[PDB]
Amino acid sequence: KMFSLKKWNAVAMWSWDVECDTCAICRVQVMDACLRCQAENKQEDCVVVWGECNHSFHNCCMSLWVKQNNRCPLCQQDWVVQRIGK
Template sequence: MHFLGMDDEDKSSDNEQSKPDKMFTLKRWNSVAMWSWDCSTDTCAICRVQVMDACLRCQAESKKDATNKDVTCVVCWGECNHSFHHCCISLWVKQSNRCPLCQQEWSIQRLSS
């Protein structure tokens, strides 16, 4: 009920007083939020580029094959909850099928979409 209070009652947060005319009423609220991949680390441990950005190889590529449709470099979560660029970890597992951070056996939990 206290949401209504904000509009009609004097006291917004505590709801204790109920004077008829409140001095300030919030009419419109424009808020901003930033989304990012839900990862434990911000940077990909393999290429040391932020997971929000394309991995280093993809960055190098993107200028070269501009004709290719926007190949976004997706993020990949393992069962161990560690995340890397999909490109980076795919190359990695060719050498060793373990998570580079915790040495658990690597298996993909999900990919970013």
């Protein structure tokens, strides 16, 4: 039949899978890089961290947080990581 297919180009957009779309420590959406890695011109190498109680944060943000307070910024449960981003 007419109208065969010869060559195709595909475009897709990727984003993290999370119920919450904000860091809750900084005003940066989860799909964007954190402020520190923008200031240092990092090559987009900070990922998101999942807690036991299903919280999404930047790895940079909570890595800075954990030194002072060993609890979530939203609830006050003991923080042990479950799944690192990548």
